[PDB]
Design a protein around this ligand. Structure first.
Ligand SMILES: CCC1=C(C)/C(=C/C2=NC(=C\c3[nH]c(/C=C4\NC(=O)[C@H](C)[C@H]4CC)c(C)c3CCC(=O)O)/C(CCC(=O)O)=C2C)NC1=O
Ligand SMILES: CCC1=C(C)/C(=C/C2=NC(=C\c3[nH]c(/C=C4\NC(=O)[C@H](C)[C@H]4CC)c(C)c3CCC(=O)O)/C(CCC(=O)O)=C2C)NC1=O
Ligand SMILES: CCC1=C(C)/C(=C/C2=NC(=C\c3[nH]c(/C=C4\NC(=O)[C@H](C)[C@H]4CC)c(C)c3CCC(=O)O)/C(CCC(=O)O)=C2C)NC1=O
Ligand SMILES: CCC1=C(C)/C(=C/C2=NC(=C\c3[nH]c(/C=C4\NC(=O)[C@H](C)[C@H]4CC)c(C)c3CCC(=O)O)/C(CCC(=O)O)=C2C)NC1=O
Ligand SMILES: CCC1=C(C)/C(=C/C2=NC(=C\c3[nH]c(/C=C4\NC(=O)[C@H](C)[C@H]4CC)c(C)c3CCC(=O)O)/C(CCC(=O)O)=C2C)NC1=O
Ligand SMILES: CCC1=C(C)/C(=C/C2=NC(=C\c3[nH]c(/C=C4\NC(=O)[C@H](C)[C@H]4CC)c(C)c3CCC(=O)O)/C(CCC(=O)O)=C2C)NC1=O
Ligand SMILES: CCC1=C(C)/C(=C/C2=NC(=C\c3[nH]c(/C=C4\NC(=O)[C@H](C)[C@H]4CC)c(C)c3CCC(=O)O)/C(CCC(=O)O)=C2C)NC1=O
Ligand SMILES: CCC1=C(C)/C(=C/C2=NC(=C\c3[nH]c(/C=C4\NC(=O)[C@H](C)[C@H]4CC)c(C)c3CCC(=O)O)/C(CCC(=O)O)=C2C)NC1=O
Ligand SMILES: CCC1=C(C)/C(=C/C2=NC(=C\c3[nH]c(/C=C4\NC(=O)[C@H](C)[C@H]4CC)c(C)c3CCC(=O)O)/C(CCC(=O)O)=C2C)NC1=O
Ligand SMILES: CCC1=C(C)/C(=C/C2=NC(=C\c3[nH]c(/C=C4\NC(=O)[C@H](C)[C@H]4CC)c(C)c3CCC(=O)O)/C(CCC(=O)O)=C2C)NC1=O
Ligand SMILES: CCC1=C(C)/C(=C/C2=NC(=C\c3[nH]c(/C=C4\NC(=O)[C@H](C)[C@H]4CC)c(C)c3CCC(=O)O)/C(CCC(=O)O)=C2C)NC1=O
Ligand SMILES: CCC1=C(C)/C(=C/C2=NC(=C\c3[nH]c(/C=C4\NC(=O)[C@H](C)[C@H]4CC)c(C)c3CCC(=O)O)/C(CCC(=O)O)=C2C)NC1=O
Ligand SMILES: CCC1=C(C)/C(=C/C2=NC(=C\c3[nH]c(/C=C4\NC(=O)[C@H](C)[C@H]4CC)c(C)c3CCC(=O)O)/C(CCC(=O)O)=C2C)NC1=O
Lengths: 172, 162, 284, 172, 172, 172, 173, 172
């Protein structure tokens, strides 16, 4: 588990020097940009259950044999299996935006996930068609103009979508 | 990596046969030949600090503009002169490495591999380093057959420079 | 590999005669030459009529072009580039080109270092030439010899780490090279630079257990601890796919369990209760 | 590649004894029934191209999304490609009836076929619905009473259908 | 290899409908802004070799153990190795701006690069400190105006920097 | 491929210092003890074919089912298979004594050999019973008191048997 | 996993997603009709279960006599009790296969990882399947003998009782 | 492969002078007429398959022994052989009009073609009776008055027919 605050410590320990002033001016922007990050996470987790089924209205409608008899999402515990861990993508992507660095994402969704997904027999590439459909709905909710004072969240929007692209790369 | 003991192995391995007397003849040369090569290693290691600052101030003589022109590549300020004794001091390491190995392998793998790529990008003219190595081969003070021994590998780095 | 040929699926390639274009051609042999070049160079991908390379088959009938200079024309075509080159990683290309043309796995790291330096300064045009204008190609394939699978055989000193990797390149007779279950990513880039050689999983289907490739964080291959067994008699176990409550109880399948000799009777009954199948059992 | 003649050698080599007389009386019945087997293969191969499209008149009509836009038999090389693979079932089942033992069938259609069929994304279970439709047409052709002197090849016929059932089991 | 023109075909094929008029008005803006990109792209490739060493004037000066004895950029072919493929980042980022979509970028620099970079032993995080230093120099050249008619180039530039951020995310 | 001469370079490159004088006094003993090593190798390769069958008079006599019908050394190609690579142990052990370091031994006989020996079905432990029988005959020949001037072969001899023990450890 | 004749004709019928046809139910009606014979027959194997194993061990060791002679892997006494500990486990799962009527419960226990341990331990794998055939020669001799039992053809069961032993010998050798 | 643009470079390199102003006024004329060249090529390639059979309605009707038993166009792969390379004449003549110079034509259809056509046994003169019949149909299509702005195409047409006359001279 690493951070933005702790990773700029950990490489600074490996070189064994004191922290420079332009690293502290970098972290001062992280504290300054910190409030926005909290707001983004709050909206994702409050619409967390609404994202997953709305991704499941397209993850299964686009590849309709998966549900149909024979596919690996066919029976009912198999169907509840790809809602049990469609949300675990959201459970750890929201941990990554909170920490601000994807080093907590790559131990849980990216570490051994591509190994089980050929051991089980599930289509690995049929996950990353719908994690992209989560990202299309996650940054849409995140960018909402209602109930929040206007501010620039562009850094979060593009590197929020970078966490989904890392979440799709190690499965496909 | 290239060594007369290694060159006996990789020749006999690609044929799939044992070590014949022709690979085993060759091992003998390093043993007989090396005895004079390790004489050349101690001659350069003991005179190492005299030879580096003897070289990096000899290149400033023939190329006086290298201490004057303001450029990252050029050794104008102290940071270039700090990277001067690093680079020329890297050469005497690999020359002493290829002495005790008997082959040109460590010279072939550490120093001259991809040297035309790096000198074009950083605009380091290879006429600088060949001027330092001519100072080393004339001022190491080595004598006898060991004086021949360091003189091949220095001159082998010269031809790979140009 | 007489006994293991059936498990390997290497039974077709074991006693398969090389195709061997004659100095005087005839039409029945020329089309049979082009078929076996199309299977091995393109990894058995189906070739339709528009993909048939009708002009380069035209040159072959005359006899002006030998087999080896035909294989360069199919490798330099966009057809072979559309299937492999435009999606695959560049280390994934190197294990393909060694498999397609020389017929073996990249055994050493230096071959991947050297081939990337060539592609960069001169181009993939000049990179296909470096396989064909090589001594490993000319020694085992003449000018009129169709390339085949030389991987299974001893091959005059090829590293036995190379022998494992060939089974990791292709999975059997019915596979192709765009159709394996790892897709675009490279298969022998991790095992080549780490210099560890993973399990020869047999090909599918006749083997009950196929879904085990070398995981990211696997436990070490040789243990050093006693592993809580009165004596040192430890055997490594590799399970494919473990079914259980999959989020809480078995968070990661296809992992090794390092059990010593005393409980190995008990351990195999524990694995089979979940339903995972054993791949390999290696002592330590 | 094994046979009926060669497999009763290969286990007899593993035990290292001479061939018994009741094994030779078994093989004498295999020679006696040899004429019937040849006739069956000829009938199948002469109606080989007529079987495949008549199976494709039901393989696609029963699961009609497959050729509809989105299915894996949709575009034209995908349609043609599937057909080419489908016959290869008939190319090796006819090799199995000729050899008389399914050991040449399990290296080509049964060995790695279930691995590619989750790597590509094709429905594996949607093959074995139509290989059964081949078997319904293959043993119907074999059964014909016209142009052939009558004999009882019912035993030969049942284990023709066993080769199709092995061809459907390792894909589904 | 996908495009802006071809990707709006490829999802439109998956739904199987004709292209809508507002997709063609979208592509008409892509043609309209097309001339600027060629101009923008040409400036990167003409200053392509000048970027790499000027990034190497900081990639190694900031983490100075890397070229000091022991680091993985120490010896001379090792040093020429991280100029051999510092430019391959620029070789494929310029392909991404030409195509207008990062789908050609993610097969070459983002696909298996994070796997080799723990197999070799190179610091993976020490790449993305300097790919950011490339982006600081790339958008400085692409924006600077000398002898060129002036039009807003804000849209092209922001998503030029998005390709570098995707190039840094899958290595770190 | 490493050596005694090249491995004391390769760790000395990783620390980046000049070679010390006590490392050169170490290598001076290697040159001094160098002549003895060549003599030992010559006697092994001249009795190379005589060792293998004399090991095969006990490798098969001690475990006699291996040859007997059913064992993996039964048929004739199978028998010539464990003479085609019984000598490859001697082909690379003699390369290890020539180089003086086992780093050329561990890429060919020790790297993937334990993986093929469970893929093929051969007994892996039944190799290392007879590689020990090679070592009992190899150091018996390399120790000879006839036709050679007396000298100390104690250091050269013990670590010849260490290469066989490494050759038996990675197979068993 | 554990499948049947009744459950496997469900499991492929689920994968195609159709109702069960009438000729599949006429097939299963013969399975119920031929079902009684299997139970009576299978009771004869388990009642002579311990008598089979040693009578196979009078020939498994007499034919390859170095195995119990000093040096063989059946030499010492716990090693000898090890190949009676799991000679019967072949019979423990073959009798489960005849009960279920399908070999899908046989291939998870005796056929799954058995050929992997048998080169990890050092035991001769081929020296097992010489004696599992000697079990089959004694198993179908007991199951066919008609003693104090009404006589009906038992041919279908016997041929495919011996098919389970041949599957039990193929994945070890 | 040469051009109009590159051949006026290549002789200008051999004399080693700068390009004169009347050579640039010559190349300026080509640019002005550049649109016409593109238009002619497009029409030919869109009617490319319609030309070949309509030439084959006269190439074989005029010399009718060729497809009659005995002629070299008799059997069916022999017949498909003189349609597989009747179009290769059109494949390289259209390359010549695109490049604007016949230097790409003379390496493929004119280089060794007259040598194979006496090695095979085909009538060489019976090709150039029908390549003239292609030219009679090619310049009839390239000269249409419908759907194209009207300008004289004679400068282009006469030297389109010069490429066919070069294509007939080196075969006959
Ligand atoms: C639609 C794009 C958009 C976003 C995302 C946005 C967020 C946003 N959240 C803000 C404030 C804030 N946001 C939070 C949120 C929280 N603090 C906590 O400790 C809680 C856990 C969490 C709520 C659950 C807080 C506490 C503030 C303080 C300032 C305020 O009251 O607005 C502000 C005030 C202005 C600024 O930060 O520059 C912005 C811009 N504004 C925008 O225009
Ligand atoms: C172990 C063998 C070895 C050597 C010798 C070596 C040299 C080497 N010197 C370099 C730069 C340099 N080399 C010099 C040296 C000189 N420039 C001058 O002006 C003087 C004429 C001359 C010294 C006498 C300087 C000043 C730089 C920095 C130039 C720059 O940053 O652009 C660089 C590129 C950047 C770097 O990592 O520092 C390499 C790779 N690398 C190696 O791996
Ligand atoms: C109990 C005594 C005994 C031994 C030792 C033995 C060896 C033996 N090794 C074989 C194959 C093999 N042997 C090797 C070993 C090697 N090839 C290489 O490339 C390396 C140089 C070398 C190892 C250092 C390999 C890789 C195969 C598989 C070759 C093939 O399948 O064609 C085969 C034929 C196929 C087989 O069943 O696996 C036998 C019979 N058999 C025996 O009964
Ligand atoms: C009188 C009208 C007439 C024509 C034109 C004709 C052509 C013709 N060309 C043939 C082969 C051929 N045609 C070519 C020509 C070409 N292949 C190439 O690579 C080039 C692209 C192209 C020339 C530009 C070649 C090289 C062969 C020999 C191919 C083989 O032997 O397989 C063949 C089959 C074999 C033969 O008898 O030589 C016929 C029938 N036959 C006819 O009766
Ligand atoms: C936080 C890291 C982490 C992840 C991600 C994880 C996932 C995960 N998903 C599993 C199964 C599964 N996962 C899926 C998922 C899907 N199948 C489809 O067809 C869909 C496209 C897709 C959902 C969108 C399915 C169907 C299974 C059941 C497979 C089986 O029962 O054989 C399993 C094992 C079976 C289980 O217990 O359910 C794991 C470990 N476990 C972890 O520890
Ligand atoms: C003789 C041994 C053998 C077999 C069996 C074989 C099968 C085979 N089928 C393949 C593809 C394929 N196989 C199918 C089959 C189907 N898709 C569907 O949705 C349908 C239900 C079904 C036809 C009824 C398709 C559609 C592809 C192409 C997939 C793609 O291009 O994405 C491939 C991958 C290579 C390629 O497609 O070029 C192989 C190797 N190859 C062999 O050498
Ligand atoms: C509808 C069910 C049915 C079948 C299938 C059938 C086949 C059949 N084929 C027969 C003969 C035969 N069948 C063949 C066929 C061939 N031999 C070759 O070498 C050729 C390759 C091949 C033809 C292409 C031959 C040669 C005979 C010899 C006896 C005869 O003339 O009938 C006979 C004669 C009687 C007997 O064999 O007992 C039978 C029964 N009879 C039936 O009632
Ligand atoms: C076409 C896309 C493509 C890329 C980019 C690529 C990179 C790549 N860089 C490598 C090694 C390397 N990569 C670097 C680069 C670096 N290390 C450092 O110290 C610096 C921080 C950094 C450069 C900024 C170095 C020095 C090596 C050699 C390391 C070794 O040999 O262990 C290797 C493994 C060995 C090799 O063949 O050279 C690959 C595969 N391969 C690809 O196919
Ligand atoms: C492939 C060869 C090729 C190039 C290179 C090319 C570039 C090119 N850029 C143009 C315009 C332009 N290009 C730019 C670009 C920019 N202005 C800024 O201030 C920004 C920083 C920057 C974008 C980041 C602008 C603003 C225009 C104005 C005209 C237009 O919208 O096209 C035009 C319009 C026509 C003309 O200039 O004669 C040309 C020709 N055309 C070609 O045929
Ligand atoms: C590759 C061809 C080749 C061979 C074979 C070779 C052998 C060789 N062994 C030598 C010495 C020797 N060799 C031995 C070896 C032994 N004495 C014992 O009593 C032990 C039992 C045994 C070692 C096990 C001894 C003791 C010497 C003494 C001289 C020395 O230290 O080299 C020498 C020294 C120079 C000479 O004898 O003229 C030679 C030439 N030289 C070659 O160029
Ligand atoms: C339920 C499926 C299953 C099976 C079958 C199984 C077998 C099994 N057999 C073992 C040993 C063994 N098995 C044998 C068997 C034999 N020796 C011979 O010569 C004969 C051919 C054969 C007896 C017929 C021997 C000798 C050992 C011990 C070898 C040793 O430890 O050196 C061990 C080692 C540790 C232990 O037994 O507790 C296991 C786990 N485990 C399982 O989970
Ligand atoms: C030697 C070859 C042979 C066998 C194997 C054989 C068995 C056999 N068992 C039968 C009946 C039966 N067998 C059983 C046996 C049992 N039912 C249970 O629920 C108990 C658990 C189990 C005894 C432990 C029963 C209950 C019947 C009912 C009919 C009868 O009383 O015979 C019958 C009556 C006739 C028929 O089924 O067609 C046959 C044939 N007959 C033969 O000729
Ligand atoms: C029958 C003899 C004949 C020909 C051949 C002919 C062609 C022809 N093409 C023209 C224009 C043109 N032709 C093209 C064609 C194209 N530009 C492209 O970039 C595309 C790739 C390609 C279509 C696929 C274009 C773009 C023009 C521009 C002028 C116009 O719209 O007519 C014009 C306009 C008047 C002129 O050029 O002087 C002529 C003459 N006119 C004739 O009388």
């Amino acid at each position: 588990t690493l951070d933005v605050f702790t990773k700029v410590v950990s490489q600074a320990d490996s070189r064994g020097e004191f922290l420079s002033n332009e690293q502290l001016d970098a972290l001062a922007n992280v504290v300054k940009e910190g409030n926005k990050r909290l707001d983004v996470v709050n909206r994702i987790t409050s619409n967390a259950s609404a994202i997953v089924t709305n991704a499941a209205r397209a993850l299964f409608e686009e590849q309709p044999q998966l549900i149909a008899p024979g596919g690996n999402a066919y029976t009912n515990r198999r169907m509840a299996a790809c809602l049990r861990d469609m949300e675990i993508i959201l459970r750890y992507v929201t941990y990554a935006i909170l920490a601000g660095d994807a080093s907590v994402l790559d131990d849980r969704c990216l570490n051994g996930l591509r190994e089980t997904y050929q051991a089980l027999g599930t289509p690995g590439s049929s996950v990353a068609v719908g994690v992209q459909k989560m990202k299309d709905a996650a940054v849409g909710i995140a960018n909402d103009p209602n109930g929040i004072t206007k501010g620039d969240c562009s850094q979060l929007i593009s590197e929020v979508a970078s966490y989904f692209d890392r979440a799709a790369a190690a499965v496909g | 990596v290239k060594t007369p003991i290694t060159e006996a192995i990789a020749a006999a391995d690609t044929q799939g046969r044992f070590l014949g007397n022709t690979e085993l003849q060759s091992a003998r040369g390093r043993y007989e030949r090396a005895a004079a090569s390790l004489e050349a290693a101690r001659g350069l290691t003991s005179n190492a600090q005299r030879l580096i600052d003897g070289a990096t101030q000899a290149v400033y003589q023939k190329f006086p503009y290298t201490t004057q022109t303001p450029g990252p590549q050029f050794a104008a300020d102290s940071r270039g002169k700090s990277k001067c004794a690093r680079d020329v001091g890297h050469y005497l390491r690999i020359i002493t490495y290829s002495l005790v190995a008997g082959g040109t392998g460590p010279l072939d793998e550490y120093l001259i591999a991809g040297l035309a790529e790096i000198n074009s990008t950083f605009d380091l003219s290879p006429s600088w380093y060949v001027e330092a190595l001519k100072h080393i081969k004339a001022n190491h003070g080595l004598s006898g057959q060991a004086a021949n021994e360091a003189n091949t590998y220095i001159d082998y780095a010269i031809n790979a420079l140009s | 590999i007489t006994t293991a040929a059936s498990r390997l699926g290497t039974e077709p390639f074991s006693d398969a005669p090389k195709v061997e274009l004659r100095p005087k051609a005839s039409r029945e042999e020329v089309e049979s030459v082009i078929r076996a070049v199309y299977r091995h160079v393109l990894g058995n991908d189906y070739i339709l009529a528009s993909e048939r390379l009708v002009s380069a088959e035209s040159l072959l009938r005359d006899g002006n072009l030998t087999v080896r200079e035909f294989v360069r024309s199919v490798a330099k075509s966009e057809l072979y580039k559309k299937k492999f080159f435009y999606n695959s990683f560049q280390t994934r290309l190197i294990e393909l080109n060694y498999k397609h043309l020389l017929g073996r796995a990249p055994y050493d790291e230096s071959e991947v270092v050297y081939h990337l330096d060539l592609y960069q300064n001169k181009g993939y045009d000049a990179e296909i030439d470096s396989y064909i204008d090589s001594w490993e190609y000319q020694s085992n394939f003449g000018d009129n010899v169709v390339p085949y699978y030389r991987g299974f055989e001893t091959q005059v000193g090829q590293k036995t780490a190379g022998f494992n990797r060939i089974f990791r390149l292709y999975r059997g007779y019915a596979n192709s090279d765009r159709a394996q279950v790892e897709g675009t990513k490279s298969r022998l880039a991790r095992e080549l630079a780490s210099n560890k050689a993973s399990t020869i999983v047999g090909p599918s289907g006749t083997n009950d257990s196929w879904g085990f490739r070398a995981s990211a964080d696997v436990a070490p291959k040789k243990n050093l601890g006693n592993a809580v067994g009165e004596g040192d008699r430890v055997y490594r176990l590799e399970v494919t796919g473990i079914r259980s409550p999959g989020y809480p109880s078995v968070r990661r399948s296809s992992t090794v369990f390092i059990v010593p000799y005393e409980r190995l009777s008990d351990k195999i009954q524990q694995v089979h209760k979940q339903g995972g199948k054993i791949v390999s059992v290696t002592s330590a």
